[PDB]
Amino acid sequence: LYKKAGSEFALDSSKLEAIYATSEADRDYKENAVDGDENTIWHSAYQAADKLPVSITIKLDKAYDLNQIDYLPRQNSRNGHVTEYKIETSLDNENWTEVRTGNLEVNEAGNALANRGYNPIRFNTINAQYLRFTALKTLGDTNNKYASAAELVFYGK
Ligand SMILES: OC[C@H]1O[C@@H](O)[C@H](O)[C@@H](O)[C@H]1O
Ligand SMILES: [Ca+2]
């Protein structure tokens, strides 16, 4: 059911701009989520009072008919691995359509995602220039408090 990175429908990261996130920690800025770089991450704030849900909004250079994104978890640490998510899209960054929710498989020990690479998330084709990705449950030294993402990969035309 899933496309892979080499699909003709995979959008280049240059077509993406992170325009908002609930919070950002350290130098793990929102833009790091869509820079095509597996080594950089967006990470939400992780002070004692910080908690879920958190979200990040990606703006595309124009509207696309989207039907998949891949979530790439942090490569060097499980901190912020997203295990339950929501996807919303819009044409105007104001009026959102709820596209889907879902879960990502966790490893046996329950400390990291089972798939440490690109985790595909499919959905019925929807025309969108903005996508809001919300982390509802996450893993970490403390679970369910902060989220991270190394990449979000978009598929559409
Ligand atoms: O407490 C959460 C923090 O833990 C650190 O070990 C990590 O480098 C940070 O990115 C953040 O995840
Ligand atoms: Ca990155």
Residue numbers in the entry: 6 to 162
Task: Pull verbatim passages from the article behind this deposition.
The molecular determinants of galacto-specific sugar recognition displayed by CpGH31 CBM32-3 were revealed by the X-ray crystal structures of this protein module in its apo-, galactose-bound, and GalNAc-bound states, which were determined to 1.58 Å, 1.48 Å and 2.50 Å resolution, respectively. The galactose and GalNAc coordinating amino acid residues of CBM32-3 were conserved, and included Tyr1674, His1671, Arg1702, Asn1707 and Tyr1774. Specifically, hydrogen bonds were observed between Asn1707 and the O4 hydroxyl and endocyclic oxygen, His1671 and the O4 hydroxyl, and Arg1702 and the O3 and O4 hydroxyl and 2-acetamido groups. The C6 of galactose is well-positioned to interact with the hydrophobic region formed by the adjacent side chains of Tyr1774 and Tyr1674, leaving the C1 of the sugar directed toward the solvent, which would allow for the binding of the β1-4-coordinated dissacharide LacNAc at this position. Although this residue is not conserved in CpGH31 CBM32-3, the side chain of Asp1769 is similarly positioned in an adjacent loop and could form hydrogen bond contact LacNAc. Alignment of the three CBM32-3 structures revealed minimal sugar—induced structural changes (backbone r.m.s.d < 0.22 Å) and only subtle differences in B-factors associated with the variable loops were also observed.
As part of the secreted C. perfringens CAZyme arsenal, the bacterium possesses an open reading frame coding for a 220-kDa family 31 glycoside hydrolase (locus tag CPF_1301 in strain ATCC 13124) with predicted α-glucosidase activity, which will be hereafter referred to as CpGH31. Though the putative CBMs, referred to as CBM32-1, CBM32-2, CBM32-3, themselves are not closely related at the amino acid sequence level, a primary structure comparison indicates that they all belong to CBM family 32, an observation that is supported by their overall similar structures as determined by X-ray crystallography.
